[PDB]
């Protein structure tokens, strides 16, 4: 358990936080192959390829690093779930490729930037900030 309010999702490559973030998502998915035979009662599963996808939500601003970020940008992310406080688990995403950005708001609504990224064949490293 960590707070997450203090958590900083910051660009590894730029070195700075994207903006007024609302949320951060990181999922590492490993696909598996399950095999069974009719003379065998159970299926054995072996994990194959692993890929990482994530979305970070920000408030859209003209003066925003997130605004600078664009779909199709390959950028590394120094995500700190527990923030920059030392010893917090932090994910050093490497070469995440931004897939899409959403900028939708109602008249009442505050403009929001939804940035979705998927990995480029690299795996985020769960290092501890020191």
């Amino acid at each position: 358990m960590l707070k997450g309010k203090d958590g900083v999702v910051k660009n590894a490559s730029t070195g700075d936080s994207i903006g007024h973030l609302q949320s951060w998502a990181l999922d590492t998915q490993r696909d598996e192959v399950s095999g069974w035979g009719m003379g065998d009662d159970a299926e054995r599963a072996f994990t194959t390829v692993g890929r990482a996808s994530g979305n970070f939500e920000v408030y859209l601003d003209p003066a925003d690093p997130s605004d600078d970020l664009e779909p199709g940008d390959l950028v590394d992310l120094e995500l700190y779930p527990g923030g920059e406080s030392t010893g917090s688990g932090y994910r050093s995403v490497a070469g995440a490729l931004i897939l899409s950005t959403a900028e939708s708001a109602s008249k009442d609504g505050i403009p929001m930037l939804t940035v979705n990224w998927r990995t480029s064949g690299a795996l985020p490293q769960k290092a501890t900030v020191s």
């Binding site: 035979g37 009719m38 003379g39 065998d40 009662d41």
Partner: protein, 214 residues
Amino acid sequence: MQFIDVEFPRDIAAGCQAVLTRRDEVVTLASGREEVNSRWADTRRSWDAGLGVRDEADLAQVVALFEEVRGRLYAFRFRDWLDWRTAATRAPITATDQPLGLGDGSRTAFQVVKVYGAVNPYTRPLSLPHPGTVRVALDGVTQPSGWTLTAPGGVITFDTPPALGVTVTAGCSFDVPVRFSDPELAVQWAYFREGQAGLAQAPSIPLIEVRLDP
């Protein structure tokens, strides 16, 4: 000939295909000219079975049964659901439902005949009347004893020939003769044991209704 009568299980028959096979066409010039060749004695039926097996043990039973005839030795008894009812699937078959013919005072023997069509009906003699569904009727009254039914023959013989003017009507279930089209049989059984499977639909079992030459 004497042939063989071996029952095909009705449950296996439940999973069986039906296709009408008819011959005698060979037409002439394609100038709109048509000539009717006559092959003779046609109207056989085509079936694919094994879809009614349900489980491995039953599948084994049909396979053993195919082995029994060692490749369709002589005749094989097949239950035909379509021809089983001389009336309707929802209507009970009766002696009156199918008309065997009219006794002439010398007509001791009548083969069970299925008349299909009306103005120019084709009549099919039935080799095996299913036992217990055979009822004989006469115009005056349903006929009981004194009719000798040859189960292999399909012929019912009145000991005293019916006099002229009495209609012989008999309706019975049809145990049709069948000869398998192909010796090869595909086996879909699904390995059991730890898997504990078994298969309800063995495929590619082909049989042809056979009008046996007597």
